[PDB]
Design a protein around this nucleic acid. Structure first.
Lengths: 186, 122, 122, 50, 145
RNA sequence: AGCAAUGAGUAGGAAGACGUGGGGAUUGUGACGAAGCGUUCGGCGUAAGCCUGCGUGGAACAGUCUCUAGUGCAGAUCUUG
RNA sequence: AGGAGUGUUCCUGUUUCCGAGCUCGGUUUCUGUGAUGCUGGCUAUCGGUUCCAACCGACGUCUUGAAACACGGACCAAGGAGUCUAACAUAUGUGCGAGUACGGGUUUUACUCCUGUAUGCGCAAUGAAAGUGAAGUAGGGAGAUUUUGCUUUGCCAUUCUUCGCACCUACGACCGACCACGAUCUCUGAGAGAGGUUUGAGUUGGAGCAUAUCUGUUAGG
RNA sequence: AAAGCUAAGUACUGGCGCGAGACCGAUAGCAAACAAGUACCGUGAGGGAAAGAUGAAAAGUUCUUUGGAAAGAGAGUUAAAAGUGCCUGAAAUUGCUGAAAAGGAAGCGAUUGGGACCUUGAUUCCAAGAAGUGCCGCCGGUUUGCCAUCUAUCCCUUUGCCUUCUCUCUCUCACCAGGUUUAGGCUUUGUCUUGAUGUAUUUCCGGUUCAUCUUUUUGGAGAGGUCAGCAUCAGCU
């Protein structure tokens, strides 16, 4: 008999465990939750959380973007809880020393040839338990087909949301609403 | 090779698991307790061992083991060793020594079982 | 084991109007009727099961004897209950022969493991 | 089997065109070797109770 | 996986997940896109603006391939032909020729940046910007047809 | 494992369990008696349900992890008997 | 409060009384954290399954409102109601990643395995169309680094200047459309340069494709 | 153009003849597992059911006895009457017997009680005896190899290559060669095993008998269980 809001008992919104049945990812988390709990460094606490993320937050960073975040800071190990893709536009790949979950086989060839080390996360623990002189990165989350559609809903004044439309070009959602000559602009 | 990786395959399912209500038990040789954990179980762990009454009408005890540092791991004839022991309080001391060479951590439960085992003949 | 044993209920939770109609069987079903008294919780009526009535963590599935039952099929499957004999009482199964009972029952006494069924088929 | 599946450690596997064998998220499969090496364990705190 | 669906769990509840007041009636609100003009209008304005009306001049028997024109960028090209790059880095004489038709594009657009290696690009069409960028690289432009 | 606070609920949402017919894998039971059925011999689980003594019965059935569905009834002036 | 043990060495309590300036230190017996102590009845009671008594309680659905003088329901068994296909969409798991996934060749023959050439969707948008077709900065910020406060080799600072990911907020540049210019040329055109309370589902060193399941929308019995 | 022929690949709930099944299992599956498009209804167009199971084998109950007969009762066949709509044989419903209860309903919840009925010298420890069991030891045969050594390739480190593959806008280019990816036979170079030494160990019979522990029967020392009484404390009151 308490005047309490929800008598909370209030839950936490973020994910509380690993969802994968991938056994290697589970053992990765067991490492980095021993290492988070015991070591005290905030690097390991963040890496633990980012390991448990779903696929759309483990988004691929290109080799050419990974150059330019790591530009002034050449010595430091470039961590990315995520995948690493080759940039085809990048002609001469810079050497770096990357850690990540997964390299595509082009990007593994391109770094290793260019004089450039290519680590897993369990190897990063042996070198750098604290995360001393590392660079956390992550690929942009809101940069995909699906996330163009979100926001204020396309027929409202000054939204930049895409409509869900079956096909492109005229004859599809380009008349009443989109022209002033057809009723109204909005 | 890895104990934890083999476990994350076979923890939930294997030939041995035998359930009733919340209980589960594990019928393999290389297993003190017959509980299904990472520590005790045969299958998964590096250097497992069992204490079983020997199968000769059950007159005497076996200590069943593997060669240390997983030597002959791919050759399961050669890997699995046996030592026969007589049922007594006196030959507890030989068994207590032989266990702690392989595994120091499993030593209290060996003393628990070996005491129980002596009391066991078909 | 044998710790104290406290039960909260001894009565079952019989299904609402199982008494009245023989088509309604006694196996519990929550009344989802809009006007039903049992779900609305008037006094002087069938009690509903809550989790409130849950028995102790220490003593769940615990027999009057002290043991937990673990039911068993072959002669091989009793060996599992060797080191857990104090903890577990073995119930010989529904289906088993007169022959294979007297192989089980005789092998159980070699192991000092209690068998619940006794004078099972004679 | 080597002509089919290939090398493990970047070039492809001959008979399956464009195929390479998969690579785990770890190199070393286990914890206990890694967790209980000297590089981790010195930096680790002294444990606690309750 | 019928197992995993809500009906299985939902079974045993009378409404069946649709609610006692409103009910699961056969076809409230019309069928398909019907009612867009009147009752379902609020939904159309927002979500789907520009749906009603006709705009441009119609094309009878429009034929694709007449207009098709797959475009590579200037920032790529090199991906197009790795050995030549190590050839055309050196020497300062001859140049690595990129027939863009042979990989299968017609137009070239200079969205990107290119290394300063003399090169010759042959494409059916060149964007105005692409030409300026290529020339700066010391490259030459050639038209096919 | 420990500590503290909390616990009403139709329509509705989500989570973990119980049960049924088949497929794959595995561990078994059975003409010295399988399935089903009956029962104040009984037991376990908050509960869905599970286990089991005795009687009848006379030929096939079950546990575990998975896959799959024509998968759970008190009602419909429901249907057939 | 209860399976054993040893025993106060430390610790708090109460106490013997010795000294230093009510307060602190040293010392002796006693009791706690380390307490369950003594004793009896029955070996059938205790307990359990059933039926019965007694005191108190206790009169499916639509609806604001049902025990209703609202409707359905005599009894029992068995049968009986969100399914399958397609088009999308978000979410999540798995694979590969600027890519990604009708035939033929094999075969024990509906499985499996391999494979050439295309196409799909994606990698560029924008105009009705002719067409044309892409320089970052600032603020807050994860984390690292250099340094200042506290039980100590660990604890939290915002103490520092160093770089500041994602993302949000503010403003740019570039591309297409519209509007309005134009030095100078090989003058049906090109174009230095410079715009605009206009406009795009644009852009800013690319994330998608295939597959699995749920939920939703729509078509079909 | 206003005249014409033409196989193949393609379609196939019918006919004819094969092979399968994560399908249904007699209220299902076709309407039809049977004399089913049958019985039967309609003037007619049309409508359209129900109905599978004794036993391995009919060995399908002769014979005596009561009765008009149907049947009953003895006896008999069978593993069993499973006794002819006969496998198992649920519920609703019905009769008897036993057990209770009932002053114009009964059922039901919670709590006791009453009546029927069901259910319980532990664990051990020390001697002696028999019944088990048959370890090591000691031989013959057999198989593992602690530890100290010597050493292989794994792997990368390229080297001297050579061979066969594969990719490639690498070269005069039509062919050879050169890089890329594989395999192989070779090479310089720094914790999953061979060959010798035999800590130890399994299996195998004859043993050579002995340990061991098990159950049990005879003493000796030792009592758990359950329900209570009083006492001392710790918390709340």
């Amino acid at each position: 008999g308490i005047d309490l809001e929800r008598n909370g008992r209030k839950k936490k919104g973020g994910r509380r465990t690993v969802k994968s049945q991938n056994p290697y990812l589970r053992l990765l988390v067991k490492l980095y939750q021993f290492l988070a709990r015991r070591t005290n460094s905030r690097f390991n606490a963040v890496v633990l959380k980012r390991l448990m993320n779903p696929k759309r937050l483990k988004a691929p960073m290109s080799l050419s973007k990974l150059a330019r975040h790591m530009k002034g800071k050449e010595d430091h190990i470039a961590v990315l809880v995520g995948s690493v893709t080759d940039d085809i536009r990048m002609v001469h790949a810079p050497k770096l020393t990357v850690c990540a979950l997964r390299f595509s086989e082009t990007a593994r060839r391109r770094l290793e040839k260019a004089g450039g080390e290519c680590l897993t996360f369990d190897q990063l623990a042996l070198r750098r338990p604290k995360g001393s002189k590392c660079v956390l990165l992550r690929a942009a989350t809101k940069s995909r087909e699906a996330d163009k559609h979100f926001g204020a809903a396309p027929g409202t004044p000054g939204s930049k949301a895409r409509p869900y439309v079956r096909s492109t070009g005229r004859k599809f959602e380009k008349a009443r609403g989109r022209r002033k000559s057809r009723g109204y602009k909005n | 090779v890895s104990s934890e990786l083999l476990w994350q395959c076979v923890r939930r399912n294997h030939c041995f698991i035998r359930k009733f209500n919340g209980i589960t038990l594990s019928a393999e040789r290389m297993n003190l307790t017959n509980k299904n954990t990472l520590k005790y179980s045969g299958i998964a762990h590096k250097q497992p061992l069992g204490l079983n009454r020997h199968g000769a009408n059950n007159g005497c005890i076996a200590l069943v083991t593997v060669q240390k540092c997983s030597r002959a791991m791919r050759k399961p004839t050669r890997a699995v060793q046996v030592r026969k022991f007589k049922k007594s309080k006196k030959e507890m001391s030989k068994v207590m020594k032989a266990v702690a060479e392989r595994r120091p951590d499993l030593l209290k439960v060996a003393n628990k079982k070996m005491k129980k085992l002596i009391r066991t003949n078909s | 084991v044998k710790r104290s044993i406290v039960k909260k209920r001894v009565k079952s939770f019989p299904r609402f109007q199982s008494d009245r109609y023989k088509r309604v069987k006694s196996s519990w079903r929550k009344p989802k009727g809009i006007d039903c008294r049992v779900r609305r919780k008037f006094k002087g009526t069938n009690t509903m099961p809550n989790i409130g009535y849950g028995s102790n963590k220490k003593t769940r599935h615990m027999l009057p004897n002290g043991f937990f039952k673990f039911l068993v099929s072959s002669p091989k499957d009793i060996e599992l209950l060797l080191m857990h004999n104090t903890k577990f009482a073995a119930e010989i199964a529904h289906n088993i022969s007169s022959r294979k009972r007297r192989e089980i029952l005789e092998r159980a006494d070699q192991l000092n493991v209690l068998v619940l069924n006794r004078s099972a088929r004679l | 089997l080597q002509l089919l599946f290939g090398r493990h450690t970047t070039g492809t596997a001959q008979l399956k065109k464009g195929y390479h064998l998969p690579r785990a998220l770890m190199s070393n499969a286990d914890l206990s070797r890694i967790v209980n090496s000297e590089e981790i364990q010195r930096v680790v705190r002294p444990a606690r109770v309750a | 996986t019928t197992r995993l669906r809500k009906t299985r769990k939902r079974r045993g509840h009378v409404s069946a997940g649709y609610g006692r007041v409103g009910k699961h009636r056969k076809h409230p609100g019309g069928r398909g896109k019907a009612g867009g003009m009147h009752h379902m209008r609020i939904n159309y304005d927002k979500y789907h603006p520009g749906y009603f009306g006709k705009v441009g001049m119609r094309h009878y028997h429009l034929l694709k391939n007449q207009y098709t024109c797959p475009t590579v960028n200037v920032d790529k090209l090199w991906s197009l032909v790795p050995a030549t790059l190590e050839k055309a880095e050196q020497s300062k004489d001859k140049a690595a020729v990129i027939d863009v038709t042979k990989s299968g594009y017609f137009k070239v657009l200079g969205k990107g940046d290119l290394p300063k290696i003399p090169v010759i690009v042959k494409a059916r069409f060149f964007s105005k910007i692409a030409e300026k960028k290529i020339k700066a690289a010391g490259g030459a432009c050639v038209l096919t047809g």
